[PDB]
Design a protein around this nucleic acid. Structure first.
Ligand SMILES: CSC[C@H]1O[C@@H](n2cnc3c(N)ncnc32)[C@H](O)[C@@H]1O
Ligand SMILES: [K+]
Ligand SMILES: [K+]
Length: 547
DNA sequence: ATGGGACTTTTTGA
DNA sequence: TTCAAAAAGTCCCA
């Protein structure tokens, strides 16, 4: 619970260099560089060294242009601390350590150091800043205290709503206190580039700064032993004529970040691709792909006349609120106590394959159908009641909306007890399966069924055929939310926006999917024929979409 | 024992 | 009344 994260030195040197690379110290020898989340001083200590080289290399020009008694090498250290370096952190010990480090850069009157121990989101900042760098805290909607969220919802509502992250507000604060003509460069999670929550934040950035560069590391592990995916955003408040973004997108998530001495060498190498995006062409969604992918994506969008949302009804799985209380192995002897009318088949995300679901190994006790506590007393006493204390702490039980033994979000049984399509909520590839067995699931598996009015235009067999194809795997990943290494989010807020088509190839595509399903359900599966049938289907789909 | 792969709960705002 | 989003994921192993 330290809360302090060490940014890799190669990232720190890149961010500091990207802001101070072309600063004109002769024109402005009083630049104000700020880190509002400085921690122990990863960025500010490097800012000191860059500034010290800058002043020393131009000391005689400064001496000649301005006060010749003020601009001496022996005075550079005092000048940097008084007028240039600013830091803020909520952690007293980190500020105390950083104060010692800045003091020890040179070893008389004491020197005032512009280090504030405060909440950067509450501090009344008395002026704006030329340069802002650093690494803000990332805290999501579960790990943030509710009283603090009430404050964020009221004062940061332009970027913070619903399931937004704390670092959204640091983007707003950094932008707000950045001088005209200033430059900001930060490392944050990448998820705001695509997530539904980040929509308002994306609008705020696009409308208030010129985005110079986005370095997207995708699923690469920048922070050791940390489950987060990172990007570097550099932006400015300069009067720009044309506003194009440099986008550096990693191509191999397996790289060791220290392959070169500098991050610039990595960005220019074959490990990264570069392309430009017109900031004026950004909609609420930022589609940051190269020209080949953009042509591909636009081709499918224009050709497809329906979306899944148009033809399907989507829903999230059961949320029991305590899985250990209600989920049992199908061979558990405790299920002899439960009448089979209470038992539902239960699958996990790993049970979903392309076109078909694995046989379920677990059973859900649909405890909502338990009428009285005196009837079915043994089910409550010997199975569900083993977790009564944990069950009573669920929000709806504390308020009395749910009895302690009920499912927290049991949804509607009828939605699950029908032919439907299921997909994992997080996966490396498109895996849409037809469920024939009335499978229930938690929120790690999503489902949809086709609306009645569209059943004559679209069959489940046709839909899983195109959705599992290599075309639609690539098509979905163009705009999908990249979570971690080899994991995209497959959530309705993007899955339901997938567009679909029907044309002369419908019958052959549907027939190939039926053949694959028939093979996959056999005892002695020969998977080889399935792969050949998939290749032929991919050719039909590419012909249909003209790609 | 650190790095990498398999796999994914329930809290929460709206 | 009841929906769906959210990785500073989580856990294990050689
Ligand atoms: C550089 S890693 C994130 C840093 O942000 C700091 N931090 C967390 N919350 C805040 C806040 N509200 N204001 C300023 N710094 C913060 C933490 O103490 C940590 O050192
Ligand atoms: K002079
Ligand atoms: K990662």
């Amino acid at each position: 619970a330290s809360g302090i994260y060490y940014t890799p030195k190669i990232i720190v040197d890149y961010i500091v260099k990207k802001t101070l690379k072309n600063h004109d110290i002769i024109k402005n020898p009083y630049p104000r560089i700020l880190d509002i989340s400085c921690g122990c001083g990863n960025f500010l200590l490097e800012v000191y060294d860059i500034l010290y080289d800058l002043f020393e290399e131009n000391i005689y020009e400064l001496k000649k242009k301005y006060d010749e008694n003020y601009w001496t090498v022996d005075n550079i250290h005092r000048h940097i601390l008084n007028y240039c370096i600013y830091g803020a952190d909520i952690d007293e010990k980190a500020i105390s350590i950083l104060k010692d480090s800045l003091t020890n850069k040179k070893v008389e009157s004491d020197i005032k150091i512009n280090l504030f121990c405060c909440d950067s989101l509450k501090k009344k900042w008395r002026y704006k800043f030329d340069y802002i760098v650093g690494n803000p805290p990332y805290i999501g909607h579960k790990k943030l205290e509710k009283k603090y969220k009430k404050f964020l919802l009221e004062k940061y509502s332009e970027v913070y709503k619903d399931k937004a992250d704390l670092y959204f507000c640091f983007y707003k604060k950094i932008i707000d206190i950045l001088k005209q003509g200033g430059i900001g460069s930060v490392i944050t999670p990448r998820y705001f580039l695509e997530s539904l929550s980040g929509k308002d934040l994306r609008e705020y950035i696009k409308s208030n700064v010129n985005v110079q560069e986005i370095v997207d590391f995708l699923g690469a592990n920048i922070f050791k032993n940390i489950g987060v995916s990172s990007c570097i955003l550099t932006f400015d408040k300069k009067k720009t004529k044309e506003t194009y973004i440099d986008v550096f997108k990693i191509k191999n998530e397996d790289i060791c970040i220290n392959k070169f001495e500098t991050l610039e060498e990595l960005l220019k190498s074959s490990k990264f691709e570069h392309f430009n995006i017109n900031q004026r062409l950004l909609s609420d969604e930022w589609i940051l792909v190269n020209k080949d992918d953009e042509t591909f994506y636009n081709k499918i969008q224009e050709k497809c006349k329906y979306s899944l949302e148009d033809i399907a009804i989507s829903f999230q799985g059961i949320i029991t609120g305590c899985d250990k209380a209600f989920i049992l192995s199908k061979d558990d002897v405790k299920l002899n106590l439960v009448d089979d009318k209470f038992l539902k088949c239960w699958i996990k995300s790993k049970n979903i394959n392309k076109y078909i679901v694995d046989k379920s190994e677990y059973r859900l006790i649909y405890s909502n159908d338990i009428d009285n506590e005196n009837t079915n007393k043994r089910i409550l006493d010997e199975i569900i009641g083993l977790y009564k204390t944990k069950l009573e702490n669920r929000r709806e039980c504390k308020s009395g909306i749910r009895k302690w033994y009920e499912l927290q979000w049991g949804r509607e049984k009828l939605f699950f007890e029908r032919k439907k399509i299921m997909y994992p909520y997080k996966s490396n590839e498109n895996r849409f399966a037809i469920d024939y067995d009335n499978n229930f699931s938690s929120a790690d598996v999503y489902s949809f069924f086709i609306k009645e009015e569209y059943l004559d235009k679209f069959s489940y067999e046709y839909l899983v055929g195109i959705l599992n194809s290599s075309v639609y795997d690539k098509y979905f990943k163009i705009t999908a939310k990249k979570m971690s290494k080899n994991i995209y989010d497959y959530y309705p807020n993007k899955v339901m926006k997938i567009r679909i088509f029907r044309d002369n190839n419908y019958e052959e595509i549907e027939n190939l999917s039926k053949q694959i399903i028939s093979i996959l359900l056999n005892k002695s599966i020969d998977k080889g024929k399935v792969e050949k049938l998939q290749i032929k289907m991919d050719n039909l789909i590419m012909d249909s979409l003209g790609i």
